[PDB]
Amino acid sequence: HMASMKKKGSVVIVGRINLSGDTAYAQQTRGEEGCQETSQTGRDKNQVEGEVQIVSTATQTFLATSINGVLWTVYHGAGTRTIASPKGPVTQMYTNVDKDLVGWQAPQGSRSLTPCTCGSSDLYLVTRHADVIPVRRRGDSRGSLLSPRPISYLKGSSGGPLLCPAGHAVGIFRAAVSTRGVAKAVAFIPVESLETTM
Ligand SMILES: COc1ccc2nc(C)c(O[C@@H]3C[C@H]4C(=O)N[C@]5(C(=O)NS(=O)(=O)C6(C)CC6)C[C@H]5/C=C\CCCCC[C@H](NC(=O)OC5(C)CCC5)C(=O)N4C3)nc2c1
Numbered sequence: 001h002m003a004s005m006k007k008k009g010s011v012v013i014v015g016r017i018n019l020s021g022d023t024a025y026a027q028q029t030r031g032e033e034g035c036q037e038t039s040q041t042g043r044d045k046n047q048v049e050g051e052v053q054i055v056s057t058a059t060q061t062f063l064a065t066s067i068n069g070v071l072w073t074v075y076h077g078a079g080t081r082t083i084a085s086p087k088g089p090v091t092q093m094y095t096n097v098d099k100d101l102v103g104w105q106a107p108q109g110s111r112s113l114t115p116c117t118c119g120s121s122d123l124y125l126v127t128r129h130a131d132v133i134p135v136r137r138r139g140d141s142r143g144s145l146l147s148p149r150p151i152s153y154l155k156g157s158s159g160g161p162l163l164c165p166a167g168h169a170v171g172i173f174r175a176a177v178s179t180r181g182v183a184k185a186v187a188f189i190p191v192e193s194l195e196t197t198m
């Protein structure tokens, strides 16, 4: 009935991948209860820091990455959802189902990665467990893992960055290519495609 139609909750930042120092590590900033509540109100007063956020909905958890003042993630994680912010839900400023891409204005206090212009094919994928996985670029939107591993290890890291040797953003992790459950390669949204969307 019209009277009882529910609304979907906001995406909520629940932690980050700390890349500040010599050791990458995941930090949780909000537990499940506060996450649930913040998703419904869309009101998140937690201080945001860093480039790579861990985000959650009621049903999924994945990553989101700031590049050029936009917090980017995958459409298959976020759909058309708002993100929680100190003053309430914030509507997406970019949505592209054809690229599996969405973006919101970057939260106050985040830091943005710089788009790569190195042209290097020696990349590094950052996962939600703060693993930094070397990846050889193999095309415009694909790279191979130098050390394959089960897809379990990459699940939940869509929206994370592929970085060049200098720490610039090369793309946003979108999908894993596997054989008998082993991730041999990854697909990503190239940063140029983000820059065109902008
Ligand atoms: C609905 O509207 C849209 C629009 C455009 C979409 N575009 C894509 C490409 C897509 O694909 C889905 C989701 C994605 C995925 O699973 N993404 C990771 C992930 O972590 N997600 S996640 O964070 O857990 C989660 C689900 C958000 C919470 C990185 C994956 C980690 C492990 C793989 C798990 C097994 C799956 C292997 C699979 N492989 C693959 O499809 O390979 C190819 C055929 C595609 C090109 C080659 C794979 O990766 N996916 C399948 N859905 C779309 C949906």
Ligand SMILES: [Zn+2]
Binding pocket: 115, 116, 117, 118, 119, 120, 164, 165, 166, 167, 168
């Ligand atoms: Zn670079």
